[PDB]
């Protein structure tokens, strides 16, 4: 578990398997899954995915969300995911990623 | 561990520093004539002589 936590910190979708159902989702379907299914603004394929192969590349926003993902949302959703709303673990991972940008051999 | 008491049921302070400092140095207890001149309108509602 101490390695799976750092793997969740570093890599993006290591929790999500091929079946697209988490270990917490299969036991708690009402809490993890989405409650409403809205037919509206499908974002499509990410063409900007080359800039962010790891979560250390995007520490500007919360949950390692890139800047291109928040395009049509209002200023409240963008402010709630800003640097001021990050947790202690997210700020410490941003401090870690600041040096990982500087001293890493590859991504 | 450490035990605590709440000054005027709101301000959680530690029990040792309360008997030495926090309890006898309040505004409503130590200076009642000065605390009677407290402004209730212009001051914030979370600030009152029972805790300040």
């Amino acid at each position: 578990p101490v390695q799976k936590k750092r793997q969740e910190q570093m890599l993006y979708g290591v929790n999500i398997p091929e079946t697209r159902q988490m270990k917490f989702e299969e036991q708690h379907p009402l809490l993890a899954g989405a409650l409403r299914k809205l037919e509206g603004q499908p974002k499509g394929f990410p063409f900007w995915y080359r800039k962010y192969p790891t979560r250390r590349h995007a520490y500007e926003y919360r949950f390692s969300i890139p800047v291109e993902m928040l395009d049509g949302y209002n200023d409240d959703v963008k402010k709630a995911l800003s640097k001021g709303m990050m947790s202690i673990q997210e700020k410490q991972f941003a401090q870690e990623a600041m040096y990982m940008e500087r001293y890493a051999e590859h991504d | 561990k450490a035990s605590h008491i709440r000054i005027a049921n709101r301000k959680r302070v530690e029990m040792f520093v309360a008997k030495r400092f926090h309890l006898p140095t309040r505004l409503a207890t130590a200076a009642p004539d000065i605390a009677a001149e407290w402004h209730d309108e212009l001051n914030p509602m979370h600030m009152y002589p029972a805790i300040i």
Partner: protein
């Protein structure tokens, strides 16, 4: 939701509670925070009578749910403002909103296998369910219920 509060307040006049909630919202907005929601739950009679600053047992109390997105130092500032308020008898801080209860102390293999965006993006009523809330109410919102519920009283009007 990032943070939630259940403010138990003294049933004072309307202007005093309005000024208290306005000062709480001003202290939220001045520290660079956002109010997700604020809902009034009316005056109820609790099982325990809380004491005010002048040690009077209050039989009645007003409950207010306050959902906020604030930074943690600013949340500590707003929590110190709220807990030292004269009208607030008690207020618990819901800090288990992003991660569900039972993951940290439960199974160690089921610790990094959750998604925080599942719980962060929904409201507090969708995390902590009320007794009137259920799954069929959530499925009714996507089923075009307006064209279906128009015939539910066709049997009771004649009896």
């Amino acid at each position: 939701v990032f943070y939630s509060f259940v403010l138990v307040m003294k049933p004072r006049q309307r202007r005093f509670t309005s000024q208290a909630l306005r000062e709480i919202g001003v202290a939220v907005y001045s520290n660079g925070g956002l109010i997700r929601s604020i809902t009034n739950e009316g005056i109820m009679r609790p099982y325990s009578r809380f004491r005010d600053a002048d040690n009077t047992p209050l039989t009645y109390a007003r409950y207010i749910i306050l959902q906020l997105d604030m930074g943690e130092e600013e949340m500590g500032k707003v929590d110190k403002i709220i807990r030292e308020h004269q009208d607030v008898l008690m207020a618990l801080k819901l800090n288990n909103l992003e991660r569900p209860v039972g993951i940290r102390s439960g199974n160690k293999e089921l610790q990094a296998a959750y998604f925080p965006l599942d719980t962060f993006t929904r409201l507090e009523e969708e995390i902590n369910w009320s007794p009137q809330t259920s799954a069929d109410i959530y499925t009714q919102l996507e089923m075009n219920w307006k064209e279906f519920s128009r015939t539910r009283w066709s049997s009771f009007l004649r009896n």
